[PDB]
Amino acid sequence: MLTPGNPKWERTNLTYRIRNYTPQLSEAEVERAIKDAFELWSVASPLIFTRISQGEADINIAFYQRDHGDNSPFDGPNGILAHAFQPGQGIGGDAHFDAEETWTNTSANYNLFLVAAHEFGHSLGLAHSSDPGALMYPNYAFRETSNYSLPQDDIDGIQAIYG
Ligand SMILES: O=C(O)[C@H]1Cc2ccccc2CN1S(=O)(=O)c1ccc(-c2ccccc2)cc1
Ligand SMILES: [Ca+2]
Ligand SMILES: [Ca+2]
Ligand SMILES: [Zn+2]
Ligand SMILES: [Zn+2]
């Protein structure tokens, strides 16, 4: 469950910024998905996330298509959904979402809140889990989102890094 080399944030109050949006959800819907994805991790750790509207943030969030500057191009509809970088300066921590997906707040593929929640595990230093019940499992699946809380394996993982 931890990324190789154990990269972790040295501070526990991190900022984030949503750089752009996906047209398929309202702006408020995207903001809510992201807010709630961060809160999943915050309630199981000492981490506090502060949104900023402009300027430089620890965790940049953006929707991109195909080639987007980081040498890991997205691939169009389906396939890779999103990716994120391990804790560190600059691109470290940042989370990118494939702009060519269908992004939802429903049970229809792909629920943005769930994908974001998984990606922020990477942004915080977690690796993939082998535990098919974990949020950090390597394959997407819908789960009910209305009252969602971190699966136990992911609590264990974030606790192992940050207490
Ligand atoms: O893992 C990633 O971040 C990226 C990049 C990567 C790198 C190395 C190995 C596999 C993958 C798979 N992809 S992905 O886009 O296909 C993906 C995204 C989210 C979820 C997920 C799981 C559970 C709940 C909700 C979402 C699963 C897979
Ligand atoms: Ca960053
Ligand atoms: Ca894709
Ligand atoms: Zn990228
Ligand atoms: Zn992943």
Curated annotation (Swiss-Prot):
Ca(2+) 2 binds at D75, G76, N78, I80, D98, E101. The conserved cysteine present in the cysteine-switch motif binds the catalytic zinc ion, thus inhibiting the enzyme. The dissociation of the cysteine from the zinc ion upon the activation-peptide release activates the enzyme. The chain holds residues 100 to 262 of 467 of the full protein. Can degrade fibrillar type I, II, and III collagens. One of its GO terms (cellular component) is specific granule lumen. The keyword Disulfide bond applies. Keywords: Calcium, Collagen degradation, Disulfide bond, Extracellular matrix, Glycoprotein, Hydrolase, Metal-binding, Metalloprotease, Protease, Repeat, Secreted, Signal, Zinc, Zymogen. Zn(2+) 2 binds at H118, H122, H128. This is Neutrophil collagenase. One of its GO terms (molecular function) is tumor necrosis factor binding. Ca(2+) 1 binds at D58, G90, G92, D94. It comes from the Eukaryota. It comes from Homo sapiens (Human).
